[PDB]
Symmetry: D2
Subunit: 384 residues, 4 copies
Amino acid sequence: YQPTPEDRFTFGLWTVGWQGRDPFGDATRRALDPVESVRRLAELGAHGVTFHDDDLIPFGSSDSEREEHVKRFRQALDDTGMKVPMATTNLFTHPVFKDGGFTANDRDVRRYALRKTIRNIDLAVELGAETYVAWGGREGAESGGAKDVRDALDRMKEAFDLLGEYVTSQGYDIRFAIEPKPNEPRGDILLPTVGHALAFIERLERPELYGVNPEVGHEQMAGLNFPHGIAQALWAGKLFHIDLNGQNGIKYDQDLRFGAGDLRAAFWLVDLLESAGYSGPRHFDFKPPRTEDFDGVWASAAGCMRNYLILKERAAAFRADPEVQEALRASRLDELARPTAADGLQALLDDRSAFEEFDVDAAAARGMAFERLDQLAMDHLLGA
Amino acid sequence: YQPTPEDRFTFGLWTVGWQGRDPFGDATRRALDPVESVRRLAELGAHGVTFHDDDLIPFGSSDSEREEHVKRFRQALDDTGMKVPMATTNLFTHPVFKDGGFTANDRDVRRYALRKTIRNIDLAVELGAETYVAWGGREGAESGGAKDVRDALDRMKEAFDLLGEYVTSQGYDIRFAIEPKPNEPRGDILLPTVGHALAFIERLERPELYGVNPEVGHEQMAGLNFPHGIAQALWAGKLFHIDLNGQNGIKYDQDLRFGAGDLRAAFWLVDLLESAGYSGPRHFDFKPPRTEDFDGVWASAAGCMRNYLILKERAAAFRADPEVQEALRASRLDELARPTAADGLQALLDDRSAFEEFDVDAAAARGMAFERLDQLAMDHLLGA
Amino acid sequence: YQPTPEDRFTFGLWTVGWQGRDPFGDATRRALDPVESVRRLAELGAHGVTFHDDDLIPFGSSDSEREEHVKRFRQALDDTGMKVPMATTNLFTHPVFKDGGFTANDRDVRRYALRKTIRNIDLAVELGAETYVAWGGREGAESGGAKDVRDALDRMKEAFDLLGEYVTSQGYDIRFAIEPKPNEPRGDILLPTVGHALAFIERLERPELYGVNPEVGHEQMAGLNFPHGIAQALWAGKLFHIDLNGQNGIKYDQDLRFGAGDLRAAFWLVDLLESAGYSGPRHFDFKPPRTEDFDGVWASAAGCMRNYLILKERAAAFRADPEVQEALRASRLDELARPTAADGLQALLDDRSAFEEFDVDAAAARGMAFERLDQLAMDHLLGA
Amino acid sequence: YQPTPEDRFTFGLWTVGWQGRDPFGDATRRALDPVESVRRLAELGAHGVTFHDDDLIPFGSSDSEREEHVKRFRQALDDTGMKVPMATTNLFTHPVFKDGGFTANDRDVRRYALRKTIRNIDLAVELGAETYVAWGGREGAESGGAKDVRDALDRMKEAFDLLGEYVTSQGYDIRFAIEPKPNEPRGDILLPTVGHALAFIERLERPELYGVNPEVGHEQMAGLNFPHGIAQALWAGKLFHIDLNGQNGIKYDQDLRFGAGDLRAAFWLVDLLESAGYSGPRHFDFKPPRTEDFDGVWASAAGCMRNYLILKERAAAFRADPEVQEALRASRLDELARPTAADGLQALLDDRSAFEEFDVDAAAARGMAFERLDQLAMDHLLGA
Ligand SMILES: [Mg+2]
Ligand SMILES: [Mg+2]
Ligand SMILES: [Mg+2]
Ligand SMILES: [Mg+2]
Ligand SMILES: [Mg+2]
Ligand SMILES: [Mg+2]
Ligand SMILES: [Mg+2]
Ligand SMILES: [Mg+2]
């Protein structure tokens, strides 16, 4: 189960680089030099890395220091063959963003947030990134009167529209992906789920430039079915990028390694991505637990990729099995794929087999055979 | 705090009529005659009633029996002055719908589901309803392989598109509202939140005909902020109808009377509906607990309206208070309403006050004053 | 992976017999004759069956009808070799129990609840049951003023104390197990978790007669770690019985087949039960989904046992693996088993290696190696 | 609604002193000198302060520095009249505690954890504290194999037993209170709820020395009813201390000011504490949101006390109202307080009115009148 760069596994600098500071504890690990992270991830079989601006260039750095940091980074990429498919902006760590970036109540903060983003879009394009992610982690509220959400949505739309105008005017080939999260660090975060983000995109001036970057653990923080949500994003043509990790239910954002947390959900996610032919990066946004030393960090990162690859093999075996194909027909998955009324409205209304002469009791008595199908799925997942 | 029909409070027949059967217990109350419910609700100050087809006309009724039931209903409406602003279809109780109506795997069930709906749209228009609600309570799955969600979304779109074609072809003045719910009675339900429903509407052929009918308790079953979600629906121009009730957190759908459950959320909801000038019905989808006799049913229904009216008075007092208006300015709610960059992109990029000379430490040191504002809100809610 | 009666798998009559009525839908399956259920479960490899009084003897049955029903049941047990290890009382379905049985506000209902229980304890002993379960599903409240919980706990204690006096006075060899649940069908249920039930037992007059009967899905309805809770019950010597099923997170009680829901939790549960040598029944309290016909019911029941047996094999392989044993030592599980201060308090206080000369930075730098251990656990679960 | 020191409101140094570092952001406020916090809280009407060792004496401080810090603290207490009713140990911030203190897998860490605690018990007694709190925030796991929970419970018991031996041997008048939390910062924390902590205490060698210190938001992080849990702790005689704050549902630990979050739960909590005559401190463990400057910190702290006092007045008015007293009788709260069978077991068995001649249908038809009672409670809460 060995990864190759052709599997398109990517990692954020801030994942393996997380020093282990949590709300109640100090860091347990020294900081990693981004150049060291690039080399070590390349040795494990990764395809590329991602970054927030502030991960790569320390906040407040001089232009000269900024040049030096980018140059050393670019050399490690050249030395390893690693790519940078995605970048993003840190609009959440600095105290100035304590009430948000794009939807801060203070107008001068919103303007600064936009300028900070634009500078990193330029860098992202220079380094080859094809997706620019936005996680509005500070966009929200702890109390009801602090944020008029209609006004905040106007400001969020205004910011994204200005970014679309900028990339169009520069001629950049880059698309945006909004990353939803329901809460943490704000009591409630705006655009809390994949559905809310998808809905918001349709009100932007250039909707074609915007998709979603869903994260396993975030949708599970609302108790939602992550494969279902990904299916709706694919149906809408908006799955531009994805963040893979694990989460044990409705609690703080754990960012466990992929495969941890809800294992069956991970199986059904991989089944869907592979069946739909998703071609983008398989990005891991995870934190190696602070219990670990650096050997544990790399073991956790390796496990992310390993578990994707085991699940890929088991999902493929499931769909290839003639006994499963026959169970899918027994459960009428084939009929769900057929139109309800390709004959048209008037035909349906005149069809007495659809109402006047329909035997509801005979249809009702038919079992769906779903438990047999699901146990075949379980057997395949477990290799039994 | 006495309701009048001008407050536009409405109730479903199935609310005060709930007999108290739950997953673990038999009914505790006899069935109510819909004509009795109309008379009693009119005496309490309600404006109108809503219904599922099967609430009004028993399933399997003959055409003649159907005529008789509608006539007796219409007479109670004439006798009381009660209106019927909304109607809906029962696509969840009968065993035939056990895998869904619009997205059942069996094609003949989907066709029957559509014909059953169309028949009740005709009745709805005859009785004056201006909104037709769809709650796809059986649309979903307990297991991953049972439902290909992309195919199910194609079938859901196909059904709603056919309904839009029908109402257009008949010339009816009626709009559709989708009611989201995350789970129960299915393990996961399709279009689980307001955001997912809003996103789905934008892919229909005639999006103008479709909005949402959110329910307090349903969004709270995903741990989401209901006023925030309603703000996004209003921003999108899609809040066609609303279902008011109470819910204590993430658990089974309790359908408590409005004001019960999360009281502060109820305050912020009423503040928003009144400030935005929402003009539709204030519909209660609640269940009087099965501990109650019929006196308790009417006391619970009365409490729904009473609590809306107390919260309305307190929210109005909050917004009218000069001390609150001054706190809103101190927290820069006025600046959140102003454009970030009405001067345009090029101006922003050339503005050195927005980045090069912005003092982040001075902006960061400014308190938001949100706790003082929220305690003023609390004081107003509690009458202190 | 074929079950034998020596695996001690048991099923409640009400599980495979569930007709599929849920809050929003009618039954989808005909009722099963308990004699048919006993025969079919015996053919699948089950060891025994359990029952509520009202599952076996219809409520209101005459004494003569009661005799006939017990006789036919006993004959199926004799014909199949099936045992009845556990029984329980239905104190939740009938409307009289709408505010509880043992803690109903009405004193005459509490007295009836006790008499109904006592009658079935006699029957339970006659049929050989060694554990009597109590699930107080109606003991609780939807509102704060309806139930003084201190008074309700006095009444709960009074009821259980009287039952202990009864079984002692009759000389019966039977022990009680309390089954906790946090909510549903009441808004909040008394003794909501394993911890609360354990705490309550220590205040009874004869604590030795009482243990717990935890259920996978119930503890997961509070977001709690079920293996952890079972570990505390075993530590207390109180795990008298267990209910196995599956649950997808914090929502209504799904009662999925065992292995469904949180698969990793199921693995860690089986690892614990087998390592601790739990010797009681492996009882499944599950509902075959209402989508299923009777073939699906038996397929779901079979899957319960199958999944226990696959997980048993994988957990045994995990603990037998020398590479895992070495990882357990690397993570110092061996040191967690050793006393902290068997040398005593005075020794510890005089030990300068424990404080004055302890190198906190050297201890802090040691990795715990937990991610490597967990990936070995994952590899074993998946057969990789 | 002005607080006095006789209302026994207390605050932890770490509450108003929280600098605003969260998982995703830097501090927004400078550190507060504990002497300044004591003076400012005394001016607001507080009765006292609490502390972790590391809040008062910086970790690694020399003995001489330790003396100086305690002396300056003691002078502010003398100058203000503030008391120190409770103290606790920080066994969670330093990296050495990354796998726990009392239940760390490393034996030398467990020994250090005990020595660190003992040193602060001595200081606590010197400063007058009557309760010593333990929050085992690092006691737990992110993965199943990392912690054998039976062994960890043996180590937890061993630690608490040694602390009881120490305080007995020194002759100290101090009692212990365990503070439960279900998760955060560990994926699952041992003794996750009030019930689990109560159960664990009964296995200690000197149970009389140990109670609980429940926290509003922690029990609500498991979706549990906090007043119910407090009622069970009072019933057990174990409510030694309480932590008051607010929490919006099942998510990260928000530590909002008291009254925020679930307002009705706060009303029912205050009703219970006052009715039961709880005489200990009303301690606030809350965090002023990081959006706030120092004026906002003190406004948030003031709001904690204000909201307790408003709720106290409304709960007293509720219980004093003759119309409520009559509703309580109508709902048979008086009968819930009466014994079920003070006549004894034999009497109950011979009483044909309890079973043979009991009219279940007549009892079942009686309404409980709970909705009328609850609306009277709502009316009183809102001042209507
Ligand atoms: Mg995350
Ligand atoms: Mg992410
Ligand atoms: Mg509902
Ligand atoms: Mg509704
Ligand atoms: Mg259950
Ligand atoms: Mg059970
Ligand atoms: Mg807390
Ligand atoms: Mg606390």
